[PDB]
Amino acid sequence: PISPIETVPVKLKPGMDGPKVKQWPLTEEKIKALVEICTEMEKEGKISKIGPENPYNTPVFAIKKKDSTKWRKLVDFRELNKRTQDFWEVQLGIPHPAGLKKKKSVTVLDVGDAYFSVPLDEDFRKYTAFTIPSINNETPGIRYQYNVLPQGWKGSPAIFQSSMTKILEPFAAQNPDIVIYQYMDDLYVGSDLEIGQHRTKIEELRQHLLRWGLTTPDKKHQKEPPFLWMGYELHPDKWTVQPIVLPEKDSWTVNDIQKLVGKLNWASQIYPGIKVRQLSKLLRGTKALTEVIPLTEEAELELAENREILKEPVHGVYYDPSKDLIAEIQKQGQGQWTYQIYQEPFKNLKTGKYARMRGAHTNDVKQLTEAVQKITTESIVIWGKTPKFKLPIQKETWETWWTEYWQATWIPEWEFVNTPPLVKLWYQLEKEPIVGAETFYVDGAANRETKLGKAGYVTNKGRQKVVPLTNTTNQKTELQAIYLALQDSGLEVNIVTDSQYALGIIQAQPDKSESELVNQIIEQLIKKEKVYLAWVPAHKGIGGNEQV
Amino acid sequence: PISPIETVPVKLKPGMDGPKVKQWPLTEEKIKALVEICTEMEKEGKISKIGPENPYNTPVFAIKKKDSTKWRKLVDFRELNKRTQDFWEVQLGIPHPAGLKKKKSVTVLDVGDAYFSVPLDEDFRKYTAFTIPSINNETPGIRYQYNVLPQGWKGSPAIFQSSMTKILEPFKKQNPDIVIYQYMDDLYVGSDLEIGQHRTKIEELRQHLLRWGLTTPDKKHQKEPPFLWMGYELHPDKWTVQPIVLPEKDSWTVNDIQKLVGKLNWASQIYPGIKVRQLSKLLRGTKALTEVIPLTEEAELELAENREILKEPVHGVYYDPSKDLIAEIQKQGQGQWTYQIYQEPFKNLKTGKYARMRGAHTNDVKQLTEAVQKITTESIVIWGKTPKFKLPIQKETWETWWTEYWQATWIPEWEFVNTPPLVKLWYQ
Numbered sequence: 001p002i003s004p005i006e007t008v009p010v011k012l013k014p015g016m017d018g019p020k021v022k023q024w025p026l027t028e029e030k031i032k033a034l035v036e037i038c039t040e041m042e043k044e045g046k047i048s049k050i051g052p053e054n055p056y057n058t059p060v061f062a063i064k065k066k067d068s069t070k071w072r073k074l075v076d077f078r079e080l081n082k083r084t085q086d087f088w089e090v091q092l093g094i095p096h097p098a099g100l101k102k103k104k105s106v107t108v109l110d111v112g113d114a115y116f117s118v119p120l121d122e123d124f125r126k127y128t129a130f131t132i133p134s135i136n137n138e139t140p141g142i143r144y145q146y147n148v149l150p151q152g153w154k155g156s157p158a159i160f161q162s163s164m165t166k167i168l169e170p171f172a173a174q175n176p177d178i179v180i181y182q183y184m185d186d187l188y189v190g191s192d193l194e195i196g197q198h199r200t201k202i203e204e205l206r207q208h209l210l211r212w213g214l215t216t217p218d219k220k221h222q223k224e225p226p227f228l229w230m231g232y233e234l235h236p237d238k239w240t241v242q243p244i245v246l247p248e249k250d251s252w253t254v255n256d257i258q259k260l261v262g263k264l265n266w267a268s269q270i271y272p273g274i275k276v277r278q279l280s281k282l283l284r285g286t287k288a289l290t291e292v293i294p295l296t297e298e299a300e301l302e303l304a305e306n307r308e309i310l311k312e313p314v315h316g317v318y319y320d321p322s323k324d325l326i327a328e329i330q331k332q333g334q335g336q337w338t339y340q341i342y343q344e345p346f347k348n349l350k351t352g353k354y355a356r357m358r359g360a361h362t363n364d365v366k367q368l369t370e371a372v373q374k375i376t377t378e379s380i381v382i383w384g385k386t387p388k389f390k391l392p393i394q395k396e397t398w399e400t401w402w403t404e405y406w407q408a409t410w411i412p413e414w415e416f417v418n419t420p421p422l423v424k425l426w427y428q429l430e431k432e433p434i435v436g437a438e439t440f441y442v443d444g445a446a447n448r449e450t451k452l453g454k455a456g457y458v459t460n461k462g463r464q465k466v467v468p469l470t471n472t473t474n475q476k477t478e479l480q481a482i483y484l485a486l487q488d489s490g491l492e493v494n495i496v497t498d499s500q501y502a503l504g505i506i507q508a509q510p511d512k513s514e515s516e517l518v519n520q521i522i523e524q525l526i527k528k529e530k531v532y533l534a535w536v537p538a539h540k541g542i543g544g545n546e547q548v
Numbered sequence: 549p550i551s552p553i554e555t556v557p558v559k560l561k562p563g564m565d566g567p568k569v570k571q572w573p574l575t576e577e578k579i580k581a582l583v584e585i586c587t588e589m590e591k592e593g594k595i596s597k598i599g600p601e602n603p604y605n606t607p608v609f610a611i612k613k614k615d616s617t618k619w620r621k622l623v624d625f626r627e628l629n630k631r632t633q634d635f636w637e638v639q640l641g642i643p644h645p646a647g648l649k650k651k652k653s654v655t656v657l658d659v660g661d662a663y664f665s666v667p668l669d670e671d672f673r674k675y676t677a678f679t680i681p682s683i684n685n686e687t688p689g690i691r692y693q694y695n696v697l698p699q700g701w702k703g704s705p706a707i708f709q710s711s712m713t714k715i716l717e718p719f720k721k722q723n724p725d726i727v728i729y730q731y732m733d734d735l736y737v738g739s740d741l742e743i744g745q746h747r748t749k750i751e752e753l754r755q756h757l758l759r760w761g762l763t764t765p766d767k768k769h770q771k772e773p774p775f776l777w778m779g780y781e782l783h784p785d786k787w788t789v790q791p792i793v794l795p796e797k798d799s800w801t802v803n804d805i806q807k808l809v810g811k812l813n814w815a816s817q818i819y820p821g822i823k824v825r826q827l828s829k830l831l832r833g834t835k836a837l838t839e840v841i842p843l844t845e846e847a848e849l850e851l852a853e854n855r856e857i858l859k860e861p862v863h864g865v866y867y868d869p870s871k872d873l874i875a876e877i878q879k880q881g882q883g884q885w886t887y888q889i890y891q892e893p894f895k896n897l898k899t900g901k902y903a904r905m906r907g908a909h910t911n912d913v914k915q916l917t918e919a920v921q922k923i924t925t926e927s928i929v930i931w932g933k934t935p936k937f938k939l940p941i942q943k944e945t946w947e948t949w950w951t952e953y954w955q956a957t958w959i960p961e962w963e964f965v966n967t968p969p970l971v972k973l974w975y976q
């Protein structure tokens with residue numbers, strides 16, 4: 001049989017037993033349809049009839065496919081799968097085309113009857129036992145078991161991949177002018193060899209595999225570029241995404257919105273400028289998978305922009321190790337960032353976008369840093385080096401920022417590209433208090449029940465103000481106090497606040513938020529020349545005038 | 549070599565399975581290096597290739613070792629350690645000398661190579677599985693498991709402990725005043741001798757161990773050293789909680805006194821016997837920040853009384869062996885970093901400041917990495933165990949770049965903080 005391939009030893013999960021499920025049922029119309037399959041599988045040595053000796057057992061169902069000339073046997077291994085040991089996880093992610101090297105020729109070989117071509121560990125086989133019944137009347141049910149990897153069995157993919165990998169080594173040893181990538185039941189071979197000897201080599205590999213019991217395309221030899229693979233279009237000199245289709249609807253489903261943002265973020269690999277923000281903000285509600293969700297003007301505008309970019313196709317190229325790797329980032333402005341990875345000006349390996357969905361308040365430089373981080377990781381995964389960066393930020397700007405920042409930040413080799421909207425910090429608080437500046441002592445408070453509260457200040461010039469607030473919180477009033485001090489002061493101002501929160505926001509130097517209060521505070525801070533924010537403990541009775 | 553005896557059986561704490569941990573993506577360079585190293589280890593029988601029926605995995609990295617110019621493989625065993633040695637700090641646990649921290653000088657030696665001689669229990673090997681990753685998921689990763697006691701596993705020195713004791717015993721006889729503690733792949737040797745005599749004795753232990761068949765590639769510059777001064781020698785008697793200092797100026801301002809009162813009020817959580825009342829009086833209300841405010845009698849009395857109370861260590865602060873060690877670090881800028889090692893909040897077992905040299909040979913991540921290593925080493929010497937760090941850095945950044953600067957053979961536990969407040973200028 002298929003014995004030459006060395007079996008992989010398999011244990012059941014410790015402290016368990018094989019599946020004992022008995023099958024009497026059910027229908028006689030599909031029984032003699034099952035026998036037709038089982039006899040031909042038995043003759044092919046894939047399954048073997050087992051006897052009276054009281055083995056285990058598993059349910060077996062029969063079903064059909066359209067164009068009924070093809071019958072289907074489906075064995076349910078779920079229980080056994082519960083009871084079998086864990087295996088090394090099969091390859092999770094898939095190789096990204098931007099990391100592939102251009103080869104003079106590429107061939108695709110799928111192996112048919114894959115799992116059934118790899119033997120199953122002998123001692124384990126008894127646990128794969130199953131029964132085909134008859135209708136009563138002193139007839140013992142037909143008992144079989146698998147000699148090979150059962151379709152749907154837990155350990156089948158990993159053991160198969162292991163076996164293929166092994167079988168490939170006596171070949172790849174004799175031929176390292178040719179590179180073989182392995183994915184599932186597919187082998188992707190490529191070479192810079194002359195086309196004739198490339199073809200010859202391919203056929204050699206074919207006869208090798210066939211000698212080991214692995215079938216492979218004969219009629220044809222099949223796929224010629226493209227090469228529609230895993231949602232891609234692979235062309236000899238270029239790669240792109242499988243065509244993207246955005247549906248048009250009067251009423252949008254949260255499900256369809258998930259499919260939408262999915263197709264869009266998928267499209268973002270290559271088409272530059274894709275914005276998922278508003279459409280995803282729609283999905284921010286985590287409730288009710290069937291709920292009909294309306295749109296927003298910003299959302300529909302965004303979808304329109306996406307349709308406009310998607311209208312005209314752009315293509316990605318393949319990787320050249322001799323050429324440097326460059327990543328370039330541009331700010332979209334809504335908290336969204338875009339980037340392209342290229343060794344060439346008019347050709348991109350790929351593109352992508354980074355958005356900060358964490359929390360609310362974060363500034364431009366930190367966001368740029370995080371983007372550089374994501375790009376660095378992605379580049380390590382796809383290529384194995386890190387790119388040189390082209391960033392829209394002045395040297396002195398980033399230097400000042402990282403030197404002033406409480407967290408340790410690191411960026412690799414990078415240079416300043418002059419393309420606006422250049423990233424900058426709009427205001428820098430004073431390191432030391434300002435002489436000849438009005439000193440505002442600010443405070444704010446709220447009743448967490450009534451939710452009214454108030455915000456105000458008292459200056460050293462004897463100037464005082466108290467502004468009533470409605471529908472707010474202590475934090476809101478506390479920012480409102482600083483804002484109030486900003487409105488009523490001159491170009492140079494000293495503010496003193498009792499709260500760690502407000503000081504925390506202000507010192508953080510954010511340039512934007514969804515909080516309009518903080519936005520206006522920012523605008524004030526920009527309009528100001530010198531602002532010194534200082535902190536003191538509350539209720540310590542020093543400079544603070546509070547109330548209740 | 550050969551099995552001198554049978555293998556020491558390793559039993560995991562019952563009701564717990566082996567480590568399954570994803571392998572980080574690596575640079576092509578580091579992958580190639582790992583491939584060379586592992587091919588070599590495979591030829592020498594140290595490790596073997598495994599099939600898909602081994603579910604377990606443990607991360608692997610390629611570090612630069614020491615100032616040496618060639619690569620080194622570093623396995624991150626933290627998970628497996630937690631899953632085994634936690635029961636093997638019990639059964640085989642190595643005692644920790646309390647006199648190591650009191651020595652004038654402590655040298656660290658790499659004894660790891662020893663472990664390579666000893667075989668590992670056949671049943672246990674499957675838990676040591678690791679993977680050399682492939683770029684771009686193009687080929688399935690290369691999978692090995694250890695056939696011998698692996699470096700970085702805490703059970704390794706536990707198993708080799710008797711051997712180490714036998715080899716060390718003669719040296720301890722000729723040198724009864726020298727303290728020697730083993731932590732994983734490292735040997736810490738303390739002494740009160742002169743620095744020269746100390747290094748001499750260290751070389752004596754080197755030649756001793758070597759002629760007993762235990763290699764320690766600590767050979768430094770050979771004949772004539774260029775540039776860099778020496779290497780690793782600790783001085784643990786200089787390690788203690790640092791006193792908190794109040795700013796001292798000829799004159800004070802409203803704002804200065806504000807910062808002072810603030811810092812003192814913060815310090816009240818540590819040293820409850822501080823009185824801030826007289827200190828915030830002198831500015832009664834509504835003054836300009838830059839207004840100069842001379843201090844009264846009772847004010848200066850309070851300041852001095854608070855100065856001498858802050859220069860002496862806390863009360864009720866002791867090391868709890870049942871509790872984990874926690875290390876906070878905060879960035880002070882200009883190359884300086886400060887750190888606190890504690891167990892319960894505001895009770896500090898140790899505090900310090902790590903400072904490297906500036907001028908564009910260094911960056912932030914390098915400094916933090918070296919700081920973490922230094923603190924971890926101090927912690928090893930003092931308590932015989934490593935702290936869990938709260939690192940002021942973005943998780944992905946740290947996870948990316950930490951292996952570049954990492955000279956140490958162990959890995960402490962860590963987690964990341966996005967919060968920290970005004971407590972920066974208060975700790976320096």
Ligand SMILES: N#C/C=C/c1cc(Cl)cc(Oc2ccc(Cl)cc2OCCn2ccc(=O)[nH]c2=O)c1
Pocket residue numbers: 095100101102103104105106107108179180181188189190223225227228229234235236237318
């Ligand atoms: N189904 C399916 C295929 C899927 C598939 C999937 C992968 Cl990960 C790779 C693949 O083909 C390749 C195989 C091996 C190498 Cl070194 C490059 C390849 O480049 C492919 C790009 N290419 C394609 C054609 C050509 O002439 N030149 C060229 O560089 C095919």
